[PDB]
Amino acid sequence: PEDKLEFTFKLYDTDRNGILDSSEVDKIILQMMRVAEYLDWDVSELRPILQEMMKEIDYDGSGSVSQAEWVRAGATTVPLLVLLGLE
Template identity: 35%
Template sequence: MGSRSSHAALIPDADSLRRETGFSQASLLRLYHRFRALDTNKKGYLSRMDLQQIGALAVNPLGDRIIDSFFPDGSLQVDFPDFVRVLAHFRPADDEDAGLRDPREPEPLNSRMNKLRFAFQLYDLDRDGKISRHEMLQVLRLMVGVQVTEEQLESIAERTVQEADEDGDGAVSFLEFAKSLEKMDIEQKMSIRILK
């Protein structure tokens, strides 16, 4: 009889990952099985091609950008702990836990601020800490495809950057980005079904 605890022993640093990501032991176990299912060649890590098998990412216009986030600094593979850390950004926020959190502990990966940081890096293509009009235009092209003319996209990108750009430098900093999204329910909008 395979007990849950014996399965959890298969997961490297399960207790540490649970604390860091907020996933329950049962969720970590499901993610571990999903990770192993995606690792079709049983390499012990995932490649970009392995992640492209995830249906929710395949149909997401920003799917390639999200997949890029699994491979920071040009890495070509992602291990299970890093896989879970990235996915934690898409876990719904625990509103009831926010007031009980020890302020000396790191902010949860699924907090509003960390979700915003993650979203910001999807737009900040050159990683310079700012979203330029050109970067906004590139992301808009991905999101709307051919449904909108290039002139309309350029107008939307220009207006979006102008509205968020409080210091007038022609780009959107992370703080400006966060402020422009303060009324959006980012905690619920940023979710991906990964277990199917």
């Protein structure tokens, strides 16, 4: 999955600076919300959950998620591609 996670990172890094800052993470969260709603889940209190998940993925507390954090998380503890509806 590491090459899939790297491919997907590059799609959300719209300014191509190699990190996902807050507004780009926010886009990722909204896509995960749209996937959940599409499946007709109850999304009432899902968004605070997705935010805290992404806070944790920022391992070094930089306010941004680097490619290595994104890949490390998506390949070990969190099914990022499933949540985005990509897998």
